[PDB]
């Protein structure tokens, strides 16, 4: 398995094998909620369309893809011993929330991901990144994973859009994998949870396959009723809409 250079909520690898197991074959793979990229990094599709509502995440990715070397250097500089204390963490966080330069924010973003509390990515109502210091003993600088990501991203495209817009890019050779925010065991609402299933129902009729991942609850079985369901031992459900 290829680790993702970022720390993202949930953890896709913790189910990775079973996903490749029901993931239809095809030319292009479409991930409406790319996330940390666990699925992307661990598959061999010809092309990739990766999207996410988080702008900071996509900016980062496009940069890692286009300016891999330049980045890795600037990034590496922040993982020295001189920056491993709350004192600095809150300084870099502030520099980030105030920055207007895409590149500088992409660098700080990684540092925040690694030195921040539980590697969370959260913002307050003002739109500022508001995660606290994680007090980690020795943060790991993902240099190996950055490059691997960068190399594989050469056959990928990153978009910053909602799930509906990205899934609307899938063609006959495309195959859709959806990893939306987990169901109840702004924010991703129940109304949208259903809208996604509704869209899946739509694509599958155009003969475009779609695989959805989510908890296994009364609500998920309800939304994904029109799909071959397979439980994975709260549990984990995989919904497959096969043409
Ligand atoms: N409307 C929307 N369209 C596309 N991506 C969205 C979205 N709402 C949230 N996201 C994105 O969805 C991604 C989910 S990441 C994977 C999450 C996981 N299985 C969990 O539930 O914890 C995040 O990266 C987030 O930025």
The alpha carbon dihedral of 80, 83, 89, 94 has a sign of negative
Coil, helix or strand at residue 59: helix
Q: Using CA atoms, how far apart are residues 122 and 129, in angstroms rounded to an integer?
A: 6
**Separation between Cα atoms, residue 107 and residue 41, nearest integer Å:** 21
Instruction: Give me the domains of the chain, ranges plus CATH numbers.
Output: 1-54+155-243 (3.40.50.150), 55-154 (1.10.1020.10)
| Residue 63: partners with Cβ closer than 8 Å, 6 or more residues away | 71, 102, 103, 106
Q: DSSP letter for 117, please.
A: G
Q: How far apart are CA 228 and CA 19, in angstroms?
A: 14
Cα-to-centroid distance, 161 and ligand 1 (Å): 11
8 is in an annotated binding site: yes
Calculate the CA dihedral of residues 65, 8, 78, 144 and round it to 10 degrees: -50
Q: Which of 31, 54, 187, 195 has the most ligand 1 atoms within 8 A of CB, as the residue to mutate?
A: 54
Is there a contact between 101 and 108 (Cβ–Cβ < 8 Å)?
no
**Spatial CB neighbours of 224, under 8 Å, sequence gap ≥ 6:** 197, 200, 212, 214, 237, 239
Q: How many CB atoms lie within 10 A of CB 122?
A: 13
**Contact (Cβ atoms closer than 8 angstroms) between residue 210 and residue 203:** yes
209 close to 175: Cβ distance less than 8 angstroms: yes
Residues within 6 Å of ligand 1 by CB: 9-10, 32-33, 35, 52-54, 162-163, 179, 181-182, 188
Identify which of 54, 51, 25 has the alpha carbon closest to the alpha carbon of residue 178. Answer: 51
Which atom from ligand 1 is nearest to the alpha carbon of 213? 19
Q: How far apart are CA 108 and CA 110, in angstroms?
A: 5
Best residue for ligand 1 mutational test, from 53, 164, 238 (most atoms within 8 Å of Cβ):
53
Q: DSSP letter string over 136-187?
A: -SS----HHHHHHHHHHGGGEEEE---HHHHHTT--TTEEEEE--S------
Does residue 170 contact residue 208 with C-beta atoms inside 8 Å?
Answer: yes
CA–centroid distance for 140 within its chain:
20
């Amino acid at each position: 398995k290829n680790r993702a250079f970022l720390k993202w909520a949930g953890g896709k690898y913790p189910l990775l094998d079973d996903i490749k197991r029901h993931l239809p074959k095809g030319e292009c793979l479409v991930e409406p909620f790319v996330g940390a990229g666990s699925v992307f990094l661990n598959t061999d599709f010809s092309r990739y369309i990766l999207a996410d509502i988080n702008s900071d995440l996509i900016s980062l990715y496009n940069i890692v893809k286009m300016r891999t070397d330049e980045y890795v250097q600037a990034a590496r500089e922040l993982f020295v011993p001189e920056t491993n204390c709350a004192e600095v963490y809150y300084q870099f966080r502030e520099e980030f929330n105030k920055s207007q330069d895409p590149f500088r924010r992409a660098v700080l973003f990684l540092y925040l991901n690694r030195y921040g509390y539980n590697g969370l990515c959260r913002y307050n109502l003002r739109g500022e990144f508001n995660v606290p210091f994680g007090r980690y003993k020795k943060p790991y600088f993902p240099e190996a994973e950055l490059y691997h990501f960068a190399e594989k991203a050469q056959n990928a495209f990153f978009y910053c859009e909602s799930y509906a817009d990205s899934m609307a890019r899938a063609d006959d050779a495309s195959v859709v994998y959806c990893d939306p925010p987990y169901a109840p065991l702004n924010s991703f609402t129940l109304e949208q949870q259903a809208h996604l299933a509704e869209i899946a129902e739509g694509l599958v009729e155009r003969h475009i396959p779609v695989l959805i991942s989510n908890h296994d609850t009364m609500l998920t079985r309800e939304w994904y009723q029109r799909a071959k369901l397979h439980v994975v031992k709260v549990d984990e459900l995989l919904a497959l809409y096969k043409p």
